[PDB]
């Protein structure tokens, strides 16, 4: 059955799903959608929430911009990750052991509930960096301290998290986001300090997999795509 | 292997996992924690995030207030729901079909990402009710139109969502929450109107299951428990 993923280079959510699909060895189509600046009129037929990513599954082979009513319409990046794991069980995108599977789901929830919001607020609103650094420390503390991925072996939990952590470093080095220069230097100093060695190793470990290389536009390209986001008003910074 | 769930009557998050455990037919212990008013000094050993629910799994049989370092410590309610589904496959707490499983996962993400924060903000900050009503209408649109549960058959997705929806109605009737009188009126009228027939049926159907009845203190008892929650300042309301 066919898979079509509606994507955008500047969407870390869509990135999650690309990574999973790579790890699964899936056959799939990707189709870019200019969701923030010029959504196509047909897009609400694949996702009525008007968000990227969106996925169609099965139905007749059709051009992405002519979706078919017969395909299943699948929304929400984390639901997609679990769906891909269900579709491709021999790819072992989750552990088999219940407790280790629980570590992956807990890690995804920790990221979604306590970290992701802080990234948004700091980068889009320029709120203080310290609560984000705290949340990143908490997340780092859920990793196996001696090495490995969230649940040991690689799982969809690492697909869920690497798109945001991998963007953090080059966006900081490029100055992109609404936070102050002061909070910028503070975040760059923290993320380079020994406080955060474990998370740097994790980013290295996730980035080294072909699933990241093959779904990453390059750091400089990703910075460029991110400047096309209006909520990231380039040249704007909030202070205290 | 033993299951201990650390609970509180006023935690809709813990309520989720009680429902799932009931639907699994599991043997388990529950243990209340006065998490907001007087957390026991040992509680960070079962959950370093200091939130309810917490779960221990396995290790030796010990009193809940003397947790053992050998038990698995499982945090985050949705991770616990998937864990229980994983532990008790014969209970069919998720569909076997992958598209149907994705409906369950999508429904949980729609709730967590667009509805839950509106409930929290309206009840605890008195933010405007209209965005909550719009998010509820969106969630109601994901239900199978003719009846049944989020993924057709009952699944953990309905354990995830019913604690919150089931609380909304008696909380409105008791005037519980920091929203204005006007928005209280608006919400009470909206949730009684034909616009939300479908979600009323959903609420009734979820509530009719023994998993709800056996984990619910009763409408007034839950109202009373909610009033013990600090951030529900009795006598405070916000107006815009
Ligand atoms: N819960 C959904 C969310 C999807 C979503 O919001 N999609 C966006 C894509 S655009 C999000 C994005 O461009 C973005 C960019 C950068 C970051 C970020 C990264 C690193 C550091 C700091 C911040 C975070 C988000 C959309 O379509 N939005 C359209 C709409 O909601 O109308 C899911 O899990 O699929
Ligand atoms: N992501 C976690 C959340 C856990 C959590 O925050 N637990 C609280 C429980 S306190 C009750 C509560 O959170 C709550 C939330 C919403 C309502 C409500 C509002 C409107 C309508 C109906 C019901 C009622 C109660 C805690 O321990 N917090 C302590 C801490 O965060 O330090 C999970 O999924 O387990
Ligand atoms: Ca519908």
mmCIF file of N, CA and C in Angstrom, chain A residues 133-232:
data_model
loop_
_atom_site.group_PDB
_atom_site.id
_atom_site.type_symbol
_atom_site.label_atom_id
_atom_site.label_comp_id
_atom_site.label_asym_id
_atom_site.label_seq_id
_atom_site.Cartn_x
_atom_site.Cartn_y
_atom_site.Cartn_z
ATOM 1 N N UNK A 133 16.787 25.281 29.194
ATOM 2 C CA UNK A 133 17.982 24.543 29.563
ATOM 3 C C UNK A 133 17.679 23.544 30.663
ATOM 4 N N UNK A 134 16.824 23.915 31.612
ATOM 5 C CA UNK A 134 16.407 22.974 32.641
ATOM 6 C C UNK A 134 15.710 21.776 32.028
ATOM 7 N N UNK A 135 14.773 22.028 31.105
ATOM 8 C CA UNK A 135 14.026 20.932 30.507
ATOM 9 C C UNK A 135 14.940 20.034 29.697
ATOM 10 N N UNK A 136 15.905 20.630 28.992
ATOM 11 C CA UNK A 136 16.864 19.823 28.251
ATOM 12 C C UNK A 136 17.723 18.998 29.187
ATOM 13 N N UNK A 137 18.053 19.537 30.374
ATOM 14 C CA UNK A 137 18.786 18.740 31.349
ATOM 15 C C UNK A 137 17.954 17.554 31.826
ATOM 16 N N UNK A 138 16.664 17.780 32.096
ATOM 17 C CA UNK A 138 15.768 16.683 32.474
ATOM 18 C C UNK A 138 15.716 15.627 31.377
ATOM 19 N N UNK A 139 15.542 16.053 30.130
ATOM 20 C CA UNK A 139 15.497 15.076 29.051
ATOM 21 C C UNK A 139 16.820 14.306 28.939
ATOM 22 N N UNK A 140 17.938 15.023 29.018
ATOM 23 C CA UNK A 140 19.235 14.366 28.974
ATOM 24 C C UNK A 140 19.340 13.324 30.085
ATOM 25 N N UNK A 141 18.761 13.617 31.239
ATOM 26 C CA UNK A 141 18.785 12.652 32.327
ATOM 27 C C UNK A 141 17.973 11.386 32.076
ATOM 28 N N UNK A 142 17.042 11.399 31.136
ATOM 29 C CA UNK A 142 16.381 10.149 30.788
ATOM 30 C C UNK A 142 17.202 9.245 29.874
ATOM 31 N N UNK A 143 18.270 9.734 29.246
ATOM 32 C CA UNK A 143 19.068 8.882 28.379
ATOM 33 C C UNK A 143 19.912 7.915 29.214
ATOM 34 N N UNK A 144 20.223 6.730 28.689
ATOM 35 C CA UNK A 144 21.250 5.862 29.343
ATOM 36 C C UNK A 144 22.549 6.632 29.498
ATOM 37 N N UNK A 145 23.022 6.888 30.726
ATOM 38 C CA UNK A 145 24.179 7.797 30.867
ATOM 39 C C UNK A 145 25.447 7.301 30.182
ATOM 40 N N UNK A 146 25.608 5.995 29.945
ATOM 41 C CA UNK A 146 26.872 5.512 29.401
ATOM 42 C C UNK A 146 26.883 5.457 27.885
ATOM 43 N N UNK A 147 25.737 5.647 27.240
ATOM 44 C CA UNK A 147 25.688 5.654 25.801
ATOM 45 C C UNK A 147 24.408 5.039 25.283
ATOM 46 N N UNK A 148 24.148 5.173 23.989
ATOM 47 C CA UNK A 148 23.012 4.520 23.376
ATOM 48 C C UNK A 148 21.893 5.511 23.144
ATOM 49 N N UNK A 149 20.799 4.982 22.590
ATOM 50 C CA UNK A 149 19.636 5.803 22.270
ATOM 51 C C UNK A 149 18.625 5.756 23.423
ATOM 52 N N UNK A 150 17.497 6.443 23.241
ATOM 53 C CA UNK A 150 16.587 6.672 24.361
ATOM 54 C C UNK A 150 16.218 5.370 25.061
ATOM 55 N N UNK A 151 15.905 4.341 24.286
ATOM 56 C CA UNK A 151 15.499 3.034 24.794
ATOM 57 C C UNK A 151 16.604 1.987 24.643
ATOM 58 N N UNK A 152 17.851 2.437 24.486
ATOM 59 C CA UNK A 152 18.946 1.544 24.200
ATOM 60 C C UNK A 152 19.242 1.499 22.718
ATOM 61 N N UNK A 153 18.753 0.459 22.046
ATOM 62 C CA UNK A 153 18.728 0.448 20.583
ATOM 63 C C UNK A 153 17.947 1.655 20.068
ATOM 64 N N UNK A 154 18.211 2.022 18.819
ATOM 65 C CA UNK A 154 17.450 3.094 18.181
ATOM 66 C C UNK A 154 15.964 2.743 18.094
ATOM 67 N N UNK A 155 15.088 3.729 18.334
ATOM 68 C CA UNK A 155 13.639 3.532 18.192
ATOM 69 C C UNK A 155 12.994 4.799 17.638
ATOM 70 N N UNK A 156 11.684 4.743 17.376
ATOM 71 C CA UNK A 156 10.989 5.964 16.962
ATOM 72 C C UNK A 156 11.131 7.089 17.980
ATOM 73 N N UNK A 157 11.488 6.790 19.232
ATOM 74 C CA UNK A 157 11.642 7.884 20.185
ATOM 75 C C UNK A 157 12.732 8.847 19.727
ATOM 76 N N UNK A 158 13.780 8.315 19.086
ATOM 77 C CA UNK A 158 14.897 9.138 18.644
ATOM 78 C C UNK A 158 14.555 9.873 17.353
ATOM 79 N N UNK A 159 13.794 9.234 16.454
ATOM 80 C CA UNK A 159 13.160 9.984 15.357
ATOM 81 C C UNK A 159 12.330 11.160 15.881
ATOM 82 N N UNK A 160 11.626 10.977 16.980
ATOM 83 C CA UNK A 160 10.755 12.036 17.475
ATOM 84 C C UNK A 160 11.530 13.259 17.937
ATOM 85 N N UNK A 161 12.723 13.054 18.493
ATOM 86 C CA UNK A 161 13.427 14.106 19.227
ATOM 87 C C UNK A 161 14.564 14.723 18.412
ATOM 88 N N UNK A 162 15.245 13.952 17.581
ATOM 89 C CA UNK A 162 16.443 14.523 16.930
ATOM 90 C C UNK A 162 16.133 15.735 16.042
ATOM 91 N N UNK A 163 14.957 15.856 15.392
ATOM 92 C CA UNK A 163 14.756 17.039 14.534
ATOM 93 C C UNK A 163 14.839 18.332 15.300
ATOM 94 N N UNK A 164 14.405 18.342 16.543
ATOM 95 C CA UNK A 164 14.480 19.591 17.269
ATOM 96 C C UNK A 164 15.879 19.825 17.851
ATOM 97 N N UNK A 165 16.477 18.802 18.460
ATOM 98 C CA UNK A 165 17.813 18.965 19.022
ATOM 99 C C UNK A 165 18.863 19.257 17.944
ATOM 100 N N UNK A 166 18.774 18.608 16.765
ATOM 101 C CA UNK A 166 19.740 18.891 15.688
ATOM 102 C C UNK A 166 19.598 20.304 15.135
ATOM 103 N N UNK A 167 18.381 20.835 15.080
ATOM 104 C CA UNK A 167 18.229 22.231 14.669
ATOM 105 C C UNK A 167 18.765 23.225 15.697
ATOM 106 N N UNK A 168 18.722 22.883 16.984
ATOM 107 C CA UNK A 168 19.081 23.862 18.000
ATOM 108 C C UNK A 168 20.491 24.428 17.778
ATOM 109 N N UNK A 169 21.468 23.555 17.478
ATOM 110 C CA UNK A 169 22.867 23.986 17.443
ATOM 111 C C UNK A 169 23.108 24.948 16.290
ATOM 112 N N UNK A 170 22.749 24.629 15.041
ATOM 113 C CA UNK A 170 23.013 25.594 13.960
ATOM 114 C C UNK A 170 22.115 26.815 14.001
ATOM 115 N N UNK A 171 20.881 26.725 14.515
ATOM 116 C CA UNK A 171 20.103 27.953 14.692
ATOM 117 C C UNK A 171 20.751 28.884 15.709
ATOM 118 N N UNK A 172 21.336 28.331 16.776
ATOM 119 C CA UNK A 172 22.038 29.188 17.728
ATOM 120 C C UNK A 172 23.228 29.855 17.050
ATOM 121 N N UNK A 173 24.044 29.067 16.363
ATOM 122 C CA UNK A 173 25.235 29.603 15.725
ATOM 123 C C UNK A 173 24.892 30.609 14.645
ATOM 124 N N UNK A 174 23.702 30.515 14.060
ATOM 125 C CA UNK A 174 23.237 31.483 13.073
ATOM 126 C C UNK A 174 22.458 32.640 13.673
ATOM 127 N N UNK A 175 22.268 32.677 14.985
ATOM 128 C CA UNK A 175 21.493 33.756 15.580
ATOM 129 C C UNK A 175 19.995 33.718 15.326
ATOM 130 N N UNK A 176 19.483 32.681 14.666
ATOM 131 C CA UNK A 176 18.057 32.631 14.357
ATOM 132 C C UNK A 176 17.216 32.415 15.607
ATOM 133 N N UNK A 177 16.203 33.255 15.779
ATOM 134 C CA UNK A 177 15.232 33.192 16.852
ATOM 135 C C UNK A 177 15.091 34.528 17.540
ATOM 136 N N UNK A 178 14.034 34.682 18.335
ATOM 137 C CA UNK A 178 13.618 35.942 18.937
ATOM 138 C C UNK A 178 14.251 36.219 20.310
ATOM 139 N N UNK A 179 14.989 35.270 20.862
ATOM 140 C CA UNK A 179 15.668 35.470 22.139
ATOM 141 C C UNK A 179 16.789 36.509 22.000
ATOM 142 N N UNK A 180 17.203 37.064 23.140
ATOM 143 C CA UNK A 180 18.260 38.072 23.176
ATOM 144 C C UNK A 180 19.642 37.496 22.869
ATOM 145 N N UNK A 181 20.533 38.377 22.377
ATOM 146 C CA UNK A 181 21.926 37.981 22.173
ATOM 147 C C UNK A 181 22.495 37.393 23.453
ATOM 148 N N UNK A 182 22.108 37.969 24.594
ATOM 149 C CA UNK A 182 22.593 37.493 25.887
ATOM 150 C C UNK A 182 22.185 36.037 26.134
ATOM 151 N N UNK A 183 20.885 35.730 25.982
ATOM 152 C CA UNK A 183 20.416 34.339 26.086
ATOM 153 C C UNK A 183 21.006 33.446 24.990
ATOM 154 N N UNK A 184 21.316 34.010 23.816
ATOM 155 C CA UNK A 184 21.996 33.234 22.794
ATOM 156 C C UNK A 184 23.362 32.748 23.229
ATOM 157 N N UNK A 185 24.188 33.660 23.735
ATOM 158 C CA UNK A 185 25.518 33.266 24.184
ATOM 159 C C UNK A 185 25.409 32.280 25.345
ATOM 160 N N UNK A 186 24.451 32.512 26.239
ATOM 161 C CA UNK A 186 24.219 31.623 27.375
ATOM 162 C C UNK A 186 23.838 30.213 26.925
ATOM 163 N N UNK A 187 22.919 30.097 25.966
ATOM 164 C CA UNK A 187 22.570 28.784 25.450
ATOM 165 C C UNK A 187 23.752 28.146 24.732
ATOM 166 N N UNK A 188 24.469 28.905 23.900
ATOM 167 C CA UNK A 188 25.609 28.309 23.221
ATOM 168 C C UNK A 188 26.664 27.860 24.221
ATOM 169 N N UNK A 189 26.911 28.667 25.267
ATOM 170 C CA UNK A 189 27.858 28.254 26.309
ATOM 171 C C UNK A 189 27.366 27.004 27.032
ATOM 172 N N UNK A 190 26.088 26.956 27.397
ATOM 173 C CA UNK A 190 25.594 25.764 28.084
ATOM 174 C C UNK A 190 25.682 24.540 27.189
ATOM 175 N N UNK A 191 25.158 24.642 25.971
ATOM 176 C CA UNK A 191 25.114 23.457 25.136
ATOM 177 C C UNK A 191 26.499 22.952 24.799
ATOM 178 N N UNK A 192 27.542 23.767 24.997
ATOM 179 C CA UNK A 192 28.909 23.312 24.740
ATOM 180 C C UNK A 192 29.649 22.855 26.009
ATOM 181 N N UNK A 193 29.113 23.149 27.184
ATOM 182 C CA UNK A 193 29.711 22.846 28.474
ATOM 183 C C UNK A 193 29.594 21.358 28.815
ATOM 184 N N UNK A 194 30.257 20.944 29.913
ATOM 185 C CA UNK A 194 30.151 19.529 30.291
ATOM 186 C C UNK A 194 28.768 19.190 30.846
ATOM 187 N N UNK A 195 28.012 20.190 31.308
ATOM 188 C CA UNK A 195 26.624 19.988 31.703
ATOM 189 C C UNK A 195 25.887 19.182 30.647
ATOM 190 N N UNK A 196 26.213 19.421 29.376
ATOM 191 C CA UNK A 196 25.429 18.874 28.277
ATOM 192 C C UNK A 196 26.228 17.962 27.360
ATOM 193 N N UNK A 197 27.335 17.375 27.850
ATOM 194 C CA UNK A 197 28.077 16.412 27.038
ATOM 195 C C UNK A 197 27.199 15.244 26.586
ATOM 196 N N UNK A 198 26.368 14.713 27.468
ATOM 197 C CA UNK A 198 25.593 13.544 27.075
ATOM 198 C C UNK A 198 24.675 13.882 25.903
ATOM 199 N N UNK A 199 24.022 15.044 25.957
ATOM 200 C CA UNK A 199 23.101 15.373 24.872
ATOM 201 C C UNK A 199 23.873 15.623 23.576
ATOM 202 N N UNK A 200 25.109 16.120 23.650
ATOM 203 C CA UNK A 200 25.876 16.295 22.414
ATOM 204 C C UNK A 200 26.227 14.957 21.791
ATOM 205 N N UNK A 201 26.545 13.965 22.624
ATOM 206 C CA UNK A 201 26.802 12.626 22.121
ATOM 207 C C UNK A 201 25.548 12.039 21.474
ATOM 208 N N UNK A 202 24.402 12.240 22.112
ATOM 209 C CA UNK A 202 23.170 11.736 21.536
ATOM 210 C C UNK A 202 22.900 12.381 20.171
ATOM 211 N N UNK A 203 23.104 13.689 20.062
ATOM 212 C CA UNK A 203 22.874 14.342 18.783
ATOM 213 C C UNK A 203 23.815 13.774 17.739
ATOM 214 N N UNK A 204 25.089 13.577 18.131
ATOM 215 C CA UNK A 204 26.087 12.978 17.244
ATOM 216 C C UNK A 204 25.648 11.592 16.801
ATOM 217 N N UNK A 205 25.179 10.791 17.749
ATOM 218 C CA UNK A 205 24.790 9.416 17.449
ATOM 219 C C UNK A 205 23.582 9.362 16.512
ATOM 220 N N UNK A 206 22.597 10.237 16.734
ATOM 221 C CA UNK A 206 21.444 10.254 15.849
ATOM 222 C C UNK A 206 21.827 10.794 14.476
ATOM 223 N N UNK A 207 22.693 11.814 14.430
ATOM 224 C CA UNK A 207 23.006 12.464 13.155
ATOM 225 C C UNK A 207 23.830 11.548 12.261
ATOM 226 N N UNK A 208 24.563 10.621 12.859
ATOM 227 C CA UNK A 208 25.440 9.731 12.119
ATOM 228 C C UNK A 208 24.675 8.645 11.387
ATOM 229 N N UNK A 209 23.422 8.452 11.700
ATOM 230 C CA UNK A 209 22.696 7.402 11.017
ATOM 231 C C UNK A 209 22.293 7.884 9.626
ATOM 232 N N UNK A 210 22.280 6.987 8.641
ATOM 233 C CA UNK A 210 21.855 7.403 7.292
ATOM 234 C C UNK A 210 20.470 8.037 7.274
ATOM 235 N N UNK A 211 19.604 7.643 8.211
ATOM 236 C CA UNK A 211 18.262 8.208 8.264
ATOM 237 C C UNK A 211 18.297 9.701 8.503
ATOM 238 N N UNK A 212 19.322 10.202 9.188
ATOM 239 C CA UNK A 212 19.401 11.646 9.371
ATOM 240 C C UNK A 212 20.047 12.307 8.159
ATOM 241 N N UNK A 213 21.169 11.741 7.676
ATOM 242 C CA UNK A 213 21.875 12.350 6.555
ATOM 243 C C UNK A 213 20.957 12.485 5.351
ATOM 244 N N UNK A 214 20.235 11.420 5.047
ATOM 245 C CA UNK A 214 19.328 11.380 3.919
ATOM 246 C C UNK A 214 18.064 12.211 4.109
ATOM 247 N N UNK A 215 17.801 12.787 5.291
ATOM 248 C CA UNK A 215 16.603 13.594 5.473
ATOM 249 C C UNK A 215 16.930 15.006 5.917
ATOM 250 N N UNK A 216 18.205 15.350 5.922
ATOM 251 C CA UNK A 216 18.706 16.628 6.377
ATOM 252 C C UNK A 216 19.223 17.373 5.163
ATOM 253 N N UNK A 217 18.844 18.637 5.032
ATOM 254 C CA UNK A 217 19.225 19.436 3.870
ATOM 255 C C UNK A 217 20.636 19.990 3.952
ATOM 256 N N UNK A 218 21.377 19.670 5.005
ATOM 257 C CA UNK A 218 22.571 20.414 5.383
ATOM 258 C C UNK A 218 22.221 21.515 6.358
ATOM 259 N N UNK A 219 23.163 21.797 7.272
ATOM 260 C CA UNK A 219 22.920 22.800 8.311
ATOM 261 C C UNK A 219 22.595 24.169 7.714
ATOM 262 N N UNK A 220 23.393 24.606 6.743
ATOM 263 C CA UNK A 220 23.193 25.938 6.183
ATOM 264 C C UNK A 220 21.882 26.000 5.405
ATOM 265 N N UNK A 221 21.544 24.922 4.704
ATOM 266 C CA UNK A 221 20.268 24.880 4.012
ATOM 267 C C UNK A 221 19.118 24.931 5.014
ATOM 268 N N UNK A 222 19.234 24.196 6.144
ATOM 269 C CA UNK A 222 18.108 24.153 7.075
ATOM 270 C C UNK A 222 17.912 25.515 7.716
ATOM 271 N N UNK A 223 19.016 26.194 8.035
ATOM 272 C CA UNK A 223 18.909 27.569 8.507
ATOM 273 C C UNK A 223 18.158 28.432 7.492
ATOM 274 N N UNK A 224 18.475 28.282 6.200
ATOM 275 C CA UNK A 224 17.817 29.089 5.174
ATOM 276 C C UNK A 224 16.322 28.800 5.117
ATOM 277 N N UNK A 225 15.947 27.518 5.078
ATOM 278 C CA UNK A 225 14.531 27.170 5.067
ATOM 279 C C UNK A 225 13.815 27.720 6.287
ATOM 280 N N UNK A 226 14.499 27.749 7.434
ATOM 281 C CA UNK A 226 13.867 28.201 8.656
ATOM 282 C C UNK A 226 13.609 29.694 8.641
ATOM 283 N N UNK A 227 14.459 30.469 7.965
ATOM 284 C CA UNK A 227 14.179 31.903 7.852
ATOM 285 C C UNK A 227 12.885 32.204 7.081
ATOM 286 N N UNK A 228 12.355 31.243 6.303
ATOM 287 C CA UNK A 228 11.105 31.429 5.559
ATOM 288 C C UNK A 228 9.880 31.283 6.434
ATOM 289 N N UNK A 229 10.071 30.950 7.703
ATOM 290 C CA UNK A 229 8.991 30.830 8.662
ATOM 291 C C UNK A 229 8.624 32.221 9.163
ATOM 292 N N UNK A 230 7.372 32.697 8.981
ATOM 293 C CA UNK A 230 7.029 34.050 9.445
ATOM 294 C C UNK A 230 7.111 34.216 10.960
ATOM 295 N N UNK A 231 6.556 33.265 11.722
ATOM 296 C CA UNK A 231 6.690 33.250 13.178
ATOM 297 C C UNK A 231 8.137 33.447 13.637
ATOM 298 N N UNK A 232 9.125 33.153 12.781
ATOM 299 C CA UNK A 232 10.532 33.497 13.035
ATOM 300 C C UNK A 232 10.820 34.788 12.273
#
